[PDB]
Short mmCIF file of C-alpha atoms and ligand atoms in Angstrom, two decimals:
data_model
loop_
_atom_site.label_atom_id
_atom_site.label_comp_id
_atom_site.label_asym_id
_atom_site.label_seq_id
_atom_site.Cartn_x
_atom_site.Cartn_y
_atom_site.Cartn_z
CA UNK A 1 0.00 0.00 0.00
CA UNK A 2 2.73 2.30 0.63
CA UNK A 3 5.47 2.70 -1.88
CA UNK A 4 8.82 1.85 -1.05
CA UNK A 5 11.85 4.69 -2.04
CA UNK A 6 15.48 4.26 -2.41
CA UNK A 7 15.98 7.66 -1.83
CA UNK A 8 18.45 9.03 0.64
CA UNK A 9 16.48 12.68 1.59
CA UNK A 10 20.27 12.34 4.18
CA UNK A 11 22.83 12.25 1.03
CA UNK A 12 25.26 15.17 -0.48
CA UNK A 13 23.51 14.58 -3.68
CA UNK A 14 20.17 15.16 -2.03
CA UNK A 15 21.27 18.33 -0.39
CA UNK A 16 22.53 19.56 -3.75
CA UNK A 17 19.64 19.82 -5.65
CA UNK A 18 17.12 18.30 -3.69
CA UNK A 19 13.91 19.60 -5.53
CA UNK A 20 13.32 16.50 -8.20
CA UNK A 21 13.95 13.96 -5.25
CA UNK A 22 10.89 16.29 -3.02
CA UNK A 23 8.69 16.21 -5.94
CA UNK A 24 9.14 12.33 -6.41
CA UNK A 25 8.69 11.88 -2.82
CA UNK A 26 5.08 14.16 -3.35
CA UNK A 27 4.11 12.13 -6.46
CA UNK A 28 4.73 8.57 -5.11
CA UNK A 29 1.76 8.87 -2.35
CA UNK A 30 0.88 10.89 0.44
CA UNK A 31 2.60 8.19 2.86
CA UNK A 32 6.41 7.05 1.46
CA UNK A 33 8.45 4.56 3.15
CA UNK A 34 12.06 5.61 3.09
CA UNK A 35 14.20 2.12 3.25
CA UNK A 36 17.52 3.56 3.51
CA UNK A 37 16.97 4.18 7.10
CA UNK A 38 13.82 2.47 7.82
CA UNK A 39 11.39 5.63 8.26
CA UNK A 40 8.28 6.54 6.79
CA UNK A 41 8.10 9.99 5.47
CA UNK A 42 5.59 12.88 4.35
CA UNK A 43 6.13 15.59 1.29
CA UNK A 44 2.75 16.42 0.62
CA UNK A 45 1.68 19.89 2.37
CA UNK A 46 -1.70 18.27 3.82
CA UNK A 47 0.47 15.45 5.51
CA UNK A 48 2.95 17.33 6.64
CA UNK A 49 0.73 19.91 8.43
CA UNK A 50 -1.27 16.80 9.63
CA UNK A 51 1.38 15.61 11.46
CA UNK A 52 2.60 18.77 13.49
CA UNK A 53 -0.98 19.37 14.25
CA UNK A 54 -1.58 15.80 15.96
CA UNK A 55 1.39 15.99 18.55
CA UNK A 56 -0.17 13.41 20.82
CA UNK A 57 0.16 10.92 17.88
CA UNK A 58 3.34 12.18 16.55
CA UNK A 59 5.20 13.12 19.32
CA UNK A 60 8.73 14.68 19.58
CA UNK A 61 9.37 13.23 23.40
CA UNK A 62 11.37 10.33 21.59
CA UNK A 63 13.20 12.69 19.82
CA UNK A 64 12.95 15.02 16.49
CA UNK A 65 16.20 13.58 14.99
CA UNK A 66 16.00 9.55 13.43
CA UNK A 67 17.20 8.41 16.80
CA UNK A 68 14.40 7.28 19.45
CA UNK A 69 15.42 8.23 22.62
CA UNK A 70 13.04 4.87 23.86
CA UNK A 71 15.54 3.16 21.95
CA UNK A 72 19.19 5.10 22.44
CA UNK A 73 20.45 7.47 24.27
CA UNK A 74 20.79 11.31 23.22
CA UNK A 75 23.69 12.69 22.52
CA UNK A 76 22.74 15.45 25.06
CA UNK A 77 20.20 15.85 27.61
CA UNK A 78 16.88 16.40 26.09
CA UNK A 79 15.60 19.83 25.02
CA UNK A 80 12.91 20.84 27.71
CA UNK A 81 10.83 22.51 24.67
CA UNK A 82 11.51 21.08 21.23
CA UNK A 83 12.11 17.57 22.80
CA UNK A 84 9.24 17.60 24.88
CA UNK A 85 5.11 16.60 24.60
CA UNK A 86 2.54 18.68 26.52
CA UNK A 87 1.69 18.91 29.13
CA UNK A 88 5.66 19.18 30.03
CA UNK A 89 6.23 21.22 26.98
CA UNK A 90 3.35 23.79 27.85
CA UNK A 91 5.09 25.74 30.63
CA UNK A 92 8.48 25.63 29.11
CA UNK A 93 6.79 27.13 26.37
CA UNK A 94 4.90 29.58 27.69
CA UNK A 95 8.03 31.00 29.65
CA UNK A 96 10.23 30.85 25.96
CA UNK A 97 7.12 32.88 24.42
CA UNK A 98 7.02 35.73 27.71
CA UNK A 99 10.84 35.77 27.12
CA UNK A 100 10.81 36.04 22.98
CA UNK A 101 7.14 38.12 23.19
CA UNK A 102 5.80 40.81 21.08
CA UNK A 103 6.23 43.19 24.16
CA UNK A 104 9.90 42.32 24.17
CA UNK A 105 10.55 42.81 20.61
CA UNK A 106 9.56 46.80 21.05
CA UNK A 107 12.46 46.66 23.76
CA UNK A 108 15.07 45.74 21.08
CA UNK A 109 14.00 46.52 17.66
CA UNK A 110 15.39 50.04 17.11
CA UNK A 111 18.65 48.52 17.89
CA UNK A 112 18.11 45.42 15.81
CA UNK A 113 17.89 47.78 12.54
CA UNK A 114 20.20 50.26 13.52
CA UNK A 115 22.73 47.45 13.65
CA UNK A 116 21.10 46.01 10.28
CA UNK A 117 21.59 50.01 8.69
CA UNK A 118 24.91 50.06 9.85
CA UNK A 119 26.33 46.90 7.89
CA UNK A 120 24.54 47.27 5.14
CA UNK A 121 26.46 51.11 4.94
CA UNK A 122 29.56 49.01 6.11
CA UNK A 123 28.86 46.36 3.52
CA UNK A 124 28.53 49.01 0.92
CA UNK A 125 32.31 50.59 1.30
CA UNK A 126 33.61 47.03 0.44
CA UNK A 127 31.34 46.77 -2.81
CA UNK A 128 32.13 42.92 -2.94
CA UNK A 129 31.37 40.98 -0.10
CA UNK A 130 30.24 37.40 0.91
CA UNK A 131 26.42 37.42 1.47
CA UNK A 132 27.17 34.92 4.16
CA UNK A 133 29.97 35.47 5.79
CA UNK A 134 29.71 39.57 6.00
CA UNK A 135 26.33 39.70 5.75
CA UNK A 136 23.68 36.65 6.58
CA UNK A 137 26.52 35.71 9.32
CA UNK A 138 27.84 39.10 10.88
CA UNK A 139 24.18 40.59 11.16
CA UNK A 140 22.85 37.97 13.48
CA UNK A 141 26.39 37.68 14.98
CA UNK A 142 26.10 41.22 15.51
CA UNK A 143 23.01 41.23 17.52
CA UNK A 144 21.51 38.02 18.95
CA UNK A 145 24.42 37.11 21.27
CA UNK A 146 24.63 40.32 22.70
CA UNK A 147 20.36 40.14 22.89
CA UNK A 148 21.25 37.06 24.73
CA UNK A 149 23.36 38.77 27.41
CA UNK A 150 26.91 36.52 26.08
CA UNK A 151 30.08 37.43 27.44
CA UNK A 152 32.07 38.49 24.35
CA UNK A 153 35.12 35.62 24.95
CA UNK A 154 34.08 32.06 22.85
CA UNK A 155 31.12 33.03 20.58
CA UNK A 156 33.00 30.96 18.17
CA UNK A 157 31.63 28.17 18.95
CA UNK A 158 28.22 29.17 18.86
CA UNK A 159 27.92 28.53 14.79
CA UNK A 160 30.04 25.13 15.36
CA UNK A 161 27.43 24.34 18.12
CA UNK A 162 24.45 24.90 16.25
CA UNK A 163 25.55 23.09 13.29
CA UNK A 164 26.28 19.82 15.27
CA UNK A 165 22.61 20.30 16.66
CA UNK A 166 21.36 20.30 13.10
CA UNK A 167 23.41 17.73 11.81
CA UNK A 168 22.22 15.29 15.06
CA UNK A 169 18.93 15.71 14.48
CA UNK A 170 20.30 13.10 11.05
CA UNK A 171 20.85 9.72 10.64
CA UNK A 172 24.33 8.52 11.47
CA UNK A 173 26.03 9.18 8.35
CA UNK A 174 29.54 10.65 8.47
CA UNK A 175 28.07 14.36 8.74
CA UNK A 176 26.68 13.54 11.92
CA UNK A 177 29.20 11.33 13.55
CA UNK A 178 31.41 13.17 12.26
CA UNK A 179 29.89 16.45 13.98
CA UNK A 180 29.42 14.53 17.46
CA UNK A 181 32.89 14.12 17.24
CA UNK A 182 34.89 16.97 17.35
CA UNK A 183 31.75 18.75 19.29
CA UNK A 184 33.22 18.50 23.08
CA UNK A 185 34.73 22.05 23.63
CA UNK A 186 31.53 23.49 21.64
CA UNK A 187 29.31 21.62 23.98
CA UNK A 188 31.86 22.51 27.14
CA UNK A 189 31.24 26.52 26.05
CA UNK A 190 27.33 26.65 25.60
CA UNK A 191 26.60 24.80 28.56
CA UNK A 192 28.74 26.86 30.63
CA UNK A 193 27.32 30.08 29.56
CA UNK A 194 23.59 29.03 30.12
CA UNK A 195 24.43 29.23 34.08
CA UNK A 196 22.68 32.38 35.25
CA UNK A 197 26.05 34.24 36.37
CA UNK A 198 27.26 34.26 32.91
CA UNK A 199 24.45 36.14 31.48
CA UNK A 200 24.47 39.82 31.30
CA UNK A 201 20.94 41.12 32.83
CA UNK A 202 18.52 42.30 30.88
CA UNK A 203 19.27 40.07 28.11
CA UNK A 204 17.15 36.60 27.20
CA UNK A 205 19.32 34.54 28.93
CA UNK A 206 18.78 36.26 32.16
CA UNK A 207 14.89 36.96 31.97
CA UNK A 208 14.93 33.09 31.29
CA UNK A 209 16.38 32.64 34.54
CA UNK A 210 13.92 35.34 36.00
CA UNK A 211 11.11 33.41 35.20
CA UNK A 212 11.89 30.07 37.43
CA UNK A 213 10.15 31.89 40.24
CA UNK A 214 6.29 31.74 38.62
CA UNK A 215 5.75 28.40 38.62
CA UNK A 216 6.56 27.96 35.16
CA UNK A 217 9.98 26.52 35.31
CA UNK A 218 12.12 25.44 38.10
CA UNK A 219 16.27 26.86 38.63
CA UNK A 220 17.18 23.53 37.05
CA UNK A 221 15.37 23.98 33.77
CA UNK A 222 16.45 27.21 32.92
CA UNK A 223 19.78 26.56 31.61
CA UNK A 224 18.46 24.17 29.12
CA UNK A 225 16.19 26.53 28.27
CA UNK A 226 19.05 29.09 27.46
CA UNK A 227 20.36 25.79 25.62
CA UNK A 228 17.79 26.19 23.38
CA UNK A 229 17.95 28.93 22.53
CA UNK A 230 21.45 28.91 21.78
CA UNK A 231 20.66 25.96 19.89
CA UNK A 232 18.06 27.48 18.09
CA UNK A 233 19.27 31.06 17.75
CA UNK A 234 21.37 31.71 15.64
CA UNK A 235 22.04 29.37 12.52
CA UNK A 236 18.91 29.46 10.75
CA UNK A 237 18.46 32.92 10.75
CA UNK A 238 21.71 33.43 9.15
CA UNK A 239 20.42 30.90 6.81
CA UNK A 240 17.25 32.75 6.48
CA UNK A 241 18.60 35.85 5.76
CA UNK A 242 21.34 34.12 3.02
CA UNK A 243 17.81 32.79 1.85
CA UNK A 244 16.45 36.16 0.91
CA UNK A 245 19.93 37.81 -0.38
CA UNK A 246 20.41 34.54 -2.71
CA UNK A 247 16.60 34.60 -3.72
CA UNK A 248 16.81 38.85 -4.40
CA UNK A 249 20.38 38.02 -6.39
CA UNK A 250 18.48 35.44 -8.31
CA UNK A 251 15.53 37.43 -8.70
CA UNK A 252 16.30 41.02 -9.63
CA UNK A 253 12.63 41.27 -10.67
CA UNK A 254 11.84 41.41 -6.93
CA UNK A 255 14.29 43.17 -5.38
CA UNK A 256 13.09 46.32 -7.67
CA UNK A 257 9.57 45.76 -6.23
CA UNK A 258 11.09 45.45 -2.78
CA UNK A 259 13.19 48.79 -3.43
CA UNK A 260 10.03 50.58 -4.41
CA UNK A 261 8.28 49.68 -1.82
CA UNK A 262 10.27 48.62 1.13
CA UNK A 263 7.62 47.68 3.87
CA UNK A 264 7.83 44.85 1.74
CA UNK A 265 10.83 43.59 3.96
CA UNK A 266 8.63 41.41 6.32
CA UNK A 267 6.92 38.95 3.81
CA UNK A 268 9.84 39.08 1.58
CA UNK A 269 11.73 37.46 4.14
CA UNK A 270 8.80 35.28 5.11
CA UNK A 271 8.93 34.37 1.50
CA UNK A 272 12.35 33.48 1.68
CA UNK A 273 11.89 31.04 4.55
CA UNK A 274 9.12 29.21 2.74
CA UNK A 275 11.12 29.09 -0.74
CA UNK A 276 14.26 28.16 1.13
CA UNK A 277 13.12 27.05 4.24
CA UNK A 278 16.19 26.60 6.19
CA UNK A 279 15.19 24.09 8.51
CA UNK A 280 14.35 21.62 5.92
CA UNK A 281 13.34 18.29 7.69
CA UNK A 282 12.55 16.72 11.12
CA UNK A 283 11.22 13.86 12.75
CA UNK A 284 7.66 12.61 14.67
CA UNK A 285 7.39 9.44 16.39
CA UNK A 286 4.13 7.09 16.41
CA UNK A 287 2.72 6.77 19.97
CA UNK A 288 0.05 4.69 18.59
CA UNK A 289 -1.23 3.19 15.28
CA UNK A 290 -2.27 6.08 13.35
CA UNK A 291 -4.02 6.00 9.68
CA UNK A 292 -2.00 8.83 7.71
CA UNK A 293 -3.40 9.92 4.78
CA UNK A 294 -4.54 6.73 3.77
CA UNK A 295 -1.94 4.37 5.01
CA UNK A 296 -1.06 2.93 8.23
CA UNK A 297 1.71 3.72 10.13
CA UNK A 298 2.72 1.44 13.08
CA UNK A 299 3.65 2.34 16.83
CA UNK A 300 7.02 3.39 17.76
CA UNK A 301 7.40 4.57 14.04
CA UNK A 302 9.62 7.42 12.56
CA UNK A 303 7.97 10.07 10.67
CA UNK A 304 10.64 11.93 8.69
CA UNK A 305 8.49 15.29 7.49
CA UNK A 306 10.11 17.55 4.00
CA UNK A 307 9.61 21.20 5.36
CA UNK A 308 10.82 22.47 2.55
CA UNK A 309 8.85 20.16 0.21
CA UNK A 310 5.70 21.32 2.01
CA UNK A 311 6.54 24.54 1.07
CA UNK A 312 7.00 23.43 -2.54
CA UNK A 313 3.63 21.32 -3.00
CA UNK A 314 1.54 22.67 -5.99
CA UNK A 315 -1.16 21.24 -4.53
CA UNK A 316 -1.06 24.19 -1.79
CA UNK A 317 0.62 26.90 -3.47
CA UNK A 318 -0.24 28.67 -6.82
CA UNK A 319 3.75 28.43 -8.79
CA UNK A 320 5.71 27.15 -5.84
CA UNK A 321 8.96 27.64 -7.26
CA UNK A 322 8.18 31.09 -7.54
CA UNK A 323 10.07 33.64 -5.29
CA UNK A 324 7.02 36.13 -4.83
CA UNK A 325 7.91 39.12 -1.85
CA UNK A 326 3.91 39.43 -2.51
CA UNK A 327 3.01 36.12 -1.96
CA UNK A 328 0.17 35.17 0.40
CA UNK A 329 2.66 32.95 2.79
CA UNK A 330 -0.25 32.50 5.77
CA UNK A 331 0.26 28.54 6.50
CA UNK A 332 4.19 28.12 5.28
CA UNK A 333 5.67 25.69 7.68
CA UNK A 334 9.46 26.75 7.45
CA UNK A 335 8.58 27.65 11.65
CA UNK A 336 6.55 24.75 12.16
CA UNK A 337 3.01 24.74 13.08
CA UNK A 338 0.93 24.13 15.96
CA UNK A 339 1.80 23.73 19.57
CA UNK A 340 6.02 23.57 18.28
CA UNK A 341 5.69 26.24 16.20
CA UNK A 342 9.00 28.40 16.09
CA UNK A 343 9.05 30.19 19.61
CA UNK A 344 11.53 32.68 18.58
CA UNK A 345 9.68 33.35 14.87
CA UNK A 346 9.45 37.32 16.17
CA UNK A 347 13.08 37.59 16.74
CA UNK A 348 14.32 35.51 13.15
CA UNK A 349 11.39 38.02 11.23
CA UNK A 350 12.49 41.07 13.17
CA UNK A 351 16.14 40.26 12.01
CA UNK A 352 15.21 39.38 8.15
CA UNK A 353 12.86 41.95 7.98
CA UNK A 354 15.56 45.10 9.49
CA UNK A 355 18.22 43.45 7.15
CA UNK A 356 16.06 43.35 3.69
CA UNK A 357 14.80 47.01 4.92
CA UNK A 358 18.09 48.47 4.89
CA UNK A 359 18.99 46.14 1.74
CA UNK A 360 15.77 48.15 0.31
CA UNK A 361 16.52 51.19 0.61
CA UNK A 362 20.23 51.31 0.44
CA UNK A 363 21.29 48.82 -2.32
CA UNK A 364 19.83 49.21 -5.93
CA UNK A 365 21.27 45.90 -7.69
CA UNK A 366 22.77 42.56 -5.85
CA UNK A 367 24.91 40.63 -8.42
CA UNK A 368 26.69 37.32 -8.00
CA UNK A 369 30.10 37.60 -8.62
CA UNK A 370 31.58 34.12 -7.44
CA UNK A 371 30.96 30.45 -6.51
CA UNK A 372 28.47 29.58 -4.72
CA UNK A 373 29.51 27.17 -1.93
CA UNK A 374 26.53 25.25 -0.74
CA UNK A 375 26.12 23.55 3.30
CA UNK A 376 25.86 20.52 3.36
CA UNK A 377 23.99 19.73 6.57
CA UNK A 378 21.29 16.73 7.45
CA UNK A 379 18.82 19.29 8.17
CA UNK A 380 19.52 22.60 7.52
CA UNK A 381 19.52 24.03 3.93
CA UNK A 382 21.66 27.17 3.06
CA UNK A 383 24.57 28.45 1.88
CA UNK A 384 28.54 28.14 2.58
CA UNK A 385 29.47 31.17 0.53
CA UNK A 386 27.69 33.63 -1.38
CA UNK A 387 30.28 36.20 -3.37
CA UNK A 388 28.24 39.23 -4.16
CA UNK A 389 28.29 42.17 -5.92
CA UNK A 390 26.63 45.54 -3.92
CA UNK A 391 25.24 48.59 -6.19
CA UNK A 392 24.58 51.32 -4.11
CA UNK A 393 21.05 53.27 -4.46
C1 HEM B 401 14.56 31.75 9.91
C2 HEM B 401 14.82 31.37 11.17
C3 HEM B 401 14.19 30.13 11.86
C4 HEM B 401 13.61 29.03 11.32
C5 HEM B 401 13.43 28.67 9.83
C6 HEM B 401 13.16 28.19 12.41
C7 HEM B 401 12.52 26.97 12.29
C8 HEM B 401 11.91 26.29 13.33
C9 HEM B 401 10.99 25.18 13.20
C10 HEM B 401 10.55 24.58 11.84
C11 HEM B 401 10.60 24.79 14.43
C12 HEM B 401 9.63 23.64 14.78
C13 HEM B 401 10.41 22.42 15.24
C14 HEM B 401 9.46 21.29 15.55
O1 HEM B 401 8.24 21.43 15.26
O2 HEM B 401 9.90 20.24 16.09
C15 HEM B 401 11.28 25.64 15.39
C16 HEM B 401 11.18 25.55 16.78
C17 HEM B 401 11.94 26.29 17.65
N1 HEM B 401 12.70 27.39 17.34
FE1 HEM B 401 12.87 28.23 15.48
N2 HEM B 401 13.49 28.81 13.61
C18 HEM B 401 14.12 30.00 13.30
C19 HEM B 401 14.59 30.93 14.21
C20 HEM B 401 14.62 30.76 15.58
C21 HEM B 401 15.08 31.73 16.54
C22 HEM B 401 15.64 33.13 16.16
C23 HEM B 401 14.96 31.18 17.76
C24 HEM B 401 15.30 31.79 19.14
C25 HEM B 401 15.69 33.06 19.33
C26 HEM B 401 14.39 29.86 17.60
C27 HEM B 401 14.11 28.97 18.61
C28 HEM B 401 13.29 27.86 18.50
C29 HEM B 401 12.88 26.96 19.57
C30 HEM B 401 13.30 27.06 21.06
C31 HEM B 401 12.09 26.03 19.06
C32 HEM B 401 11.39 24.90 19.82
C33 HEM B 401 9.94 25.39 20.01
C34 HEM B 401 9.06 24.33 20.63
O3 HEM B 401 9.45 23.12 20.64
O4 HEM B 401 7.96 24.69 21.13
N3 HEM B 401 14.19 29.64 16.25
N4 HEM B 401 12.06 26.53 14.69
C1 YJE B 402 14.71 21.58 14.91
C2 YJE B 402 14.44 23.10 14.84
O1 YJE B 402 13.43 23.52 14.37
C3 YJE B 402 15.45 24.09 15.37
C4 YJE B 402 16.75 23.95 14.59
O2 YJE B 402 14.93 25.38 15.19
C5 YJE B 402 15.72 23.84 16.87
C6 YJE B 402 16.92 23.29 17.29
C7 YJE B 402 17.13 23.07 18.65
C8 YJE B 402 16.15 23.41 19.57
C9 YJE B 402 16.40 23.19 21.06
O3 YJE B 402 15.45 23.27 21.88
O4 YJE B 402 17.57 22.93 21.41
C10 YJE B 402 14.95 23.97 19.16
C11 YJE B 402 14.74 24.17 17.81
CL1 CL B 403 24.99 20.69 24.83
#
C-alpha cells in the first residue's frame, strides 16, 4: 500500500539539488516509506501539516532527529521545549514565548535595525562581499548574542554548536558522527554560559532565569532553556537571511519591487523562509497506530516530514517555485506549526525583515560575482558562501 523509495532525503547529492527527489517523494503517495533508514516519510503539504498538528500521535518526546530516545540514548540531555510533549512542553513554552514576546521585541527593535543600517552602509564601502559570511553571518552575529546577554570571549563556537545540533537531528552518516565528534569544547562553552552568572541582565538569557520563580519553570530547567535557545538562535536565521539575499540576487525582478516599496521587507523574508526554508526536515514518532493519509503507520514509528517540500507542494501553493515578496505565505511551515511552532519566529522576522529594509533602501542591484559554496547539513539548507556584488542606491 505504501510505496517503497530508495531515496536518501540524508545524502550530499540530495542536499545539492534536492527539488526533483521532493517532488518524487510528493508524487509517489501521500505516505512514502524511506528504506535507507527504515522511516516513513511525508512531502505532501496536507500530511505534513497533519502531522505537526496531531502531537499526541506524533510526538517529539522520543526525539525530532531519526534516533528514538526509547531506543538510544541522546547525545545530550533532552531539550525541555523542542524535545518535549505537553503537558511538560506547555510551561516551558509559555516561559520561551514571555521571554521572545511581542512586548519584548519593542524593547530591542530600534537597535536590531540600527545594527542592520549600519552593515549594510559598512557592507557598501567594500562593494564585494560574501552574502554569508559579511552579511547573513555578521548581522545575526552582531546582535543576537549580545540580545542574549553573552560574554564576548568564545562566541565561536556558537555557529560550530548549532551546526552539530542540526546535523544530530540526522541519521548517522559521516556528517553527523562526524559532527558529534569533534563537538566536546563546543558543547563545554554553551553549557557553561547558560548558568545564570554568565548572562548579562537584561538580556534573554537572564529573563529566562527570572522566570523560574512563577511556577513555570524550576532553577534547574532554565539553563536548558538558554540551551535552546542557543541551539536554536542563531544558525537558521543566518540561513534565512542568506535565503532572501540569494533569492533577491536570483531574482532582480523582486528586489526592484522590494526597493520601491520597502515595507515589503517582512513577507519578503517570510517568503524566503518558505522558498528556502532553512530548517528543511525533522522527525515525529508514532505513539500509537495512526491512519496517515490513507496508510497505516505502526507504533514506535519514525515520521521523517520535508519542510521544505511542504513549502514546494503545488497542490497548496499557486507556482511554488516562484520567489514572490507578494506572496500570500499564511500557513508556510518553514517555523513549524501548531503547539512547536517556532518560539523565537518574532526575533528571526524582526532580524530578516531590518536586514532586507536596509537592503531596500540602500542597495539598488545585488549581483553574483563568485561560486556559490553550498552547506551541506542533514537538516539545515543554506549556503557556505555567497560572493556578491553591492550597487549602491
Ligand atoms: C529563519 C529562522 C528560523 C527558522 C526557519 C526556524 C525553524 C523552526 C521550526 C521549523 C521549528 C519547529 C520544530 C518542531 O516542530 O519540532 C522551530 C522551533 C523552535 N525554534 Fe525556530 N526557527 C528560526 C529561528 C529561531 C530563533 C531566532 C529562535 C530563538 C531566538 C528559535 C528557537 C526555536 C525553539 C526554542 C524552538 C522549539 C519550540 C518548541 O518546541 O515549542 N528559532 N524553529
Ligand atoms: C529543529 C528546529 O526547528 C530548530 C533547529 O529550530 C531547533 C533546534 C534546537 C532546539 C532546542 O530546543 O535545542 C529547538 C529548535
Ligand atoms: Cl549541549
Amino acid at each position: 500500500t505504501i510505496p517503497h523509495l530508495a531515496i536518501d532525503p540524508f545524502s550530499l547529492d540530495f542536499f545539492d539539488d534536492p527539488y526533483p527527489d521532493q517532488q518524487t517523494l510528493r508524487d509517489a503517495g501521500p505516505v512514502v516509506y524511506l528504506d535507507k533508514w527504515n522511516v516513513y516519510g511525508v512531502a505532501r503539504y496536507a500530511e505534513v501539516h497533519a502531522v505537526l498538528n496531531d502531537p499526541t500521535t506524533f510526538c517529539s518526546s522520543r526525539g525530532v532527529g531519526l534516533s528514538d530516545f526509547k531506543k538510544e540514548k541522546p547525545w545530550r540531555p533532552p531539550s525541555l521545549i523542542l524535545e518535549a510533549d505537553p503537558p511538560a512542553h506547555t510551561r516551558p513554552r509559555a516561559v520561551l514565548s514571555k521571554v521572545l514576546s511581542p512586548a519584548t521585541m519593542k524593547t530591542i527593535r530600534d537597535g536590531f535595525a540600527a545594527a542592520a543600517d549600519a552593515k549594510v552602509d559598512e557592507l557598501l564601502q567594500r562593494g564585494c562581499i560574501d552574502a554569508i559570511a559579511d552579511l547573513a553571518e555578521a548581522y545575526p552575529l552582531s546582535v543576537f548574542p549580545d540580545a542574549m546577554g553573552l560574554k564576548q570571549e568564545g562566541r565561536e563556537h556558537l555557529l560550530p554548536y548549532a551546526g552539530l545540533v542540526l546535523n544530530a537531528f540526522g541519521p548517522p552518516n559521516e556528517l553527523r558522527q562526524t559532527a558529534i565528534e569533534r563537538s566536546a569544547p563546543h558543547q563545554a562553552y554553551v553549557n557553561e554560559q547558560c548558568q545564570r552568572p554568565n548572562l548579562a541582565p537584561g538580556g534573554f538569557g537572564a529573563c529566562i532565569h527570572a522566570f523560574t520563580d512563577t511556577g513555570e519553570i524550576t532553577p534547574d530547567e532554565a539553563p536548558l532553556l538558554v540551551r535552546s535557545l542557543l541551539s536554536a538562535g542563531l544558525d537558521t536565521t543566518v540561513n534565512g537571511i542568506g535565503a532572501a539575499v540569494y533569492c533577491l540576487a536570483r531574482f532582480p525582478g523582486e528586489l526592484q519591487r522590494l526597493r520601491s516599496d520597502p515595507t515589503l521587507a517582512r513577507n519578503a523574508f517570510e517568503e524566503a523562509v518558505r522558498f528556502e526554508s532553512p530548517v528543511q526536515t525533522f522527525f515525529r514518532t508514532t505513539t500509537r497506530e495512526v491512519e496517515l493519509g490513507g496508510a497505516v503507520i505502526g507504533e514506535g514509528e519514525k515520521v521523517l516530514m520535508f519542510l521544505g517540500s511542504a513549502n514546494r507542494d503545488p497542490r497548496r501553493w499557486s507556482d511554488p517555485d516562484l520567489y514572490d515578496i507578494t506572496r500570500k505565505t499564511s500557513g508556510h511551515v518553514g517555523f513549524g506549526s501548531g503547539v512547536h511552532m517556532c518560539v523565537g519566529q518574532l526575533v528571526a522576522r524582526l532580524e530578516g525583515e531590518v536586514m532586507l529594509s536596509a537592503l531596500a533602501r540602500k542597495v539598488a542591484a545585488i549581483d553574483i560575482d563568485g561560486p556559490v559554496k553550498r552547506r551541506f547539513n542533514n537538516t539545515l539548507r543554506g549556503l557556505e558562501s555567497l560572493p556578491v556584488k553591492l550597487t549602491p542606491a
